[PDB]
Amino acid sequence: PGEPVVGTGASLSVELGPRLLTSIYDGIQRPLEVIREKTGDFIARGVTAPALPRDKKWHFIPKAKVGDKVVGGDIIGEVPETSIIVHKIMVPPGIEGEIVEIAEEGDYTIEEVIAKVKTPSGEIKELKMYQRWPVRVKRPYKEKLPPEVPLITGQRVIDTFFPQAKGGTAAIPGPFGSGKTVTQHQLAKWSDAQVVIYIGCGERGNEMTDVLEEFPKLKDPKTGKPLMERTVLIANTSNMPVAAREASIYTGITIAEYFRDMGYDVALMADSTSRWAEALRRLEEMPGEEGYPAYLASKLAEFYERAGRVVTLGSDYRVGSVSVIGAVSPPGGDFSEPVVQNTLRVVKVFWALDADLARRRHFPAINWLTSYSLYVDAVKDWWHKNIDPEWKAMRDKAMALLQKESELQEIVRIVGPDALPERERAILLVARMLREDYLQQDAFDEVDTYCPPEKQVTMMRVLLNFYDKTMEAINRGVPLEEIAKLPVREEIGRMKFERDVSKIRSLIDKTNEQFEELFKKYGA
Ligand SMILES: Nc1ncnc2c1ncn2[C@@H]1O[C@H](COP(=O)(O)OP(=O)(O)NP(=O)(O)O)[C@@H](O)[C@@H]1O
Missing domain, CATH: 2.40.50.100 (RNA polymerase II/Efflux pump adaptor protein, barrel-sandwich hybrid domain)
Structure with a gap:
């Protein structure tokens, strides 16, 4: 311990070697709980507990x-x-x-x-x-690569419309322990990162007890083995010093960077709750190395700046990444205050979990109008080259339809639906199919819990092809009533539950021909 110095010193560090995996730590890497520390533009102190076992x-x-x-x-x-x-x-x-x-x-x-x-x-x-490393200095690397490869989540709404790049920064509302949602957990277990660093923070009540004896019972769906065998837990309980809690995201990201350096993709998930900063009090009357207006806002940027996909140190060409998903839980849940505004200025992805979507049981409750990803252009070439050359055109088209639907629903709120032309009724029909057959996903279903890239584009093609054929049928005198009750529609509503992608793909021809029948019945 000790050995302290001037600057940002006291040498605040972490150990990195076998047995980080399966461990549960606090904000400064001691193997369970409770001791009191004090933070400053200078130093900090502790006492007793060994991070990695020597025995x-x-x-x-x-x-x-x-x-x-x-x-x-x-x-x-x-x-x-x-x-x-x-x-x-x-x-x-x-x-x-x-x-x-x-x-x-x-x-x-x-x-x-x-x-x-x-x-x-x-x-x-x-x-x-x-080895030991100061948690407050980013571990070095050769080059930070541009965003390019998506972090594949297997969640359709995210992968398609609001993609995370490997090495990217994402934010999501609210505590991870919220029972209103399960995408936090889908992200942890399904993302194609080999290692997860989870900072189960904002912990109060069951938040530290049910997180204790379920994670060993938790299964890694890719391997049957426990999820803990590729996870490092960092606890932030309410009975911990506000200084070890502060330091926890730095300890977490240093440990993330350490697995990145080996050639791994790692996902860092950081939890958050309410009212951290009432301990604030420009204006800095008595400062040192902490010129403290929204200085914290610049320091948060710095943390998120440590995410990235990198060519690592080493004499072989080697790539690894740290992707960051941060929870955002505002003081009153009004999403105007500091925590949200300061996070949303730095992150490239926001998944707007939405209480109104949850209430009408549209799951994943991600608002497709208020969410955004700034990685869509960064990742498109990976989709085009590896999965489907029309990935981006198709998402853009589906989004344009979601946006048309939203404009139309506003208008219909004012004047009602009786004056809707067939064409607009047709847009509403197909947007509803997009919403129900594509955006909505069943995390509790043995098939639909994960949606491979190949399945995602095939399902999108089935839907957009149904769109094309719908508009061309309208355009040929076929009543919308006849299209609405086309037998293939209900097979389209069930394709998310089909594991055989070629059977999903066959719905394209089956759509095409059913429409032909309509074209000839209506001599259209
Ligand atoms: N089958 C499912 N597939 C995927 N996600 C699901 C499923 N069932 C439930 N969920 C989750 O349920 C969540 C609903 O969250 P929501 O209640 O809108 O958040 P919120 O109330 O705004 N804030 P918070 O819950 O505190 O984070 C969605 O994020 C997830 O879809």
Whole structure:
């Protein structure tokens, strides 16, 4: 402990090595609960509790030989840490030279020196299975890559209309423990990140008890194994010092960056509740290294600035990412106050969970008019090249229809529906199908809980093709009443529950031909 200094010092750090996975920590990486700390533009203090166990024995597979040149981030061994995650043992940033000594394959505790590096000036550096890093300094990397690859969530509304990029920043309302919603949990378990760092914060009541003995019971749907085996929990209970809680997102993101550095995609999910900043009191009369108006607003930007997909340190070309999903729960839930405005200025994605959607049981209750993603153009080429060349045209078309529907519903609120032309009735019919057959998704269903990219575009094609055929039929004298009761419509309403994508795809031809029947019946 201690060893303290001037600046932003006291050396506030985290340990990084086998046994971060499955751990539950507080805001400064102690293995359970309660001790009181005090924060400042200067230092902070603690006392007793060991982050990574020194007694446990880890299997070390060497990945480098005596005589190898190494740089920061180079991978010198592998440690099978859970049944899901292989831990990658890396040279700490700043250390380079020749490997003069390295442990043979065997079992070792984390304090055992598993390698030695002779630096260029001849200093001999001793390497263990873990390393320490100041939580307040971003771990370094070679290059931060532009947003490009979507974080695939398997949730249609998000992946299609409001995509998250790997390395992106997203915000979502309210506490993660809210029982009104389940997308928080869908995101945690289905996103294609190998590792999840979860800061179960804003915890009061059952929030720290049911989060305790369900996560070990929780299953990783991709592997049957427990979700905890690829997760690190960081607790922010109400009985914790406001300084360890503050520091928790920094400890979390440092641990995220650490798994990023191995070549992993990692998702960092940060919880939040009500009224953190009444402890505020431009205006800074007595300042130091904390010029405190909305200085915190600039510091939040800085945290979110640590998200990204990067070419990592190391001598191999290696990419990893940290994508950030932050909860936003305003003081009164009025979404005008600081917490929301300060977050919404930095994040590139907002998923507007909407109490009115939930109340009418439209699930995922994501408002498709107030949500937005600034990654749509960033990710489109990945969809075009890998999944479907018409991904972006199709989403834009479906969105235009959602927007037309919304304009039409306003007008109909004023004058009612009796004067609606067939064409506008047809737009309402197909928008309703989009809403019900595509946006709505069943998280509780064994099929519809996850929707693969290939299934998403096929379902979209079935719907947009039905749109085209509807408008061309209207355009040919076929009454809307006849289209509304086309037998294929009910198969379209059920396609989300079909796991065979070729059967979903067959609905295109089946739509086409049923419409032909109408075209000939009405001699149209
Ligand atoms: N089958 C399902 N598939 C996906 N999500 C579901 C499903 N069933 C329920 N949900 C979730 O239910 C949520 C409704 O949230 P909503 O109540 O609108 O949030 P809110 O009340 O505005 N604030 P909060 O609940 O505190 O975050 C949606 O985010 C999710 O869809």
